[PDB]
Amino acid sequence: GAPDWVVGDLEKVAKYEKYSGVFLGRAEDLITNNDVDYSTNQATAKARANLAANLKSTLQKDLENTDTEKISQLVDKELIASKMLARYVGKDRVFVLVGLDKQIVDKVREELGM
């Protein structure tokens, strides 16, 4: 059946050895016009938007050590580097998993003073 990442708790799946080097994001897109390619591209873009959103909130939480709108801009600048990791096609929708190297995330915290 479907891989663990499609329906699983992403905070738990991120602990797998396979994903130890990446920050994850996931999204789905309903197939219309029988075009799986279109929903694959849409789900990939939404998967990157999901990765960016969860990375921002994680970096805000880390600020328990102006801030808000400036992690927002520094993660959005790095999002170009994220990779498609996997695709799973369900009954009527496409799921996509993307990842961003943690070293790239390590660099972003330094710009913040972490």
Q: Given in angstroms, what resolution was this structure solved at?
A: 1.9
CA-to-CA distance for 52 and 74, rounded, in angstroms?
10
104 CB-side CA count, 13 A:
19
Q: Give the start-to-end residue ranges of the domains of the chain.
A: 1-114
In 3-state terms, what secondary structure has residue 38? helix
CA-to-CA distance for 83 and 47, rounded, in angstroms?
10
Cβ 87 vs Cβ 94: under 8 Å: yes
Q: State the method.
A: X-ray
Supply the Cα-derived Rg of the chain in whole angstroms. 15
DSSP summary character for residue 81: G
Strand extents, DSSP E, 5-114: 22-30, 83-89, 93-101
Q: Is 87 exposed, middle or buried (0-12, 13-18, 19+ CB in 10 A)?
A: middle
Number of Cβ within a 10 Å radius of residue 55: 24
In 3-state terms, what secondary structure has residue 29? strand
CA-to-CA distance for 76 and 96, rounded, in angstroms?
19
Cβ 51 vs Cβ 79: under 8 Å: yes
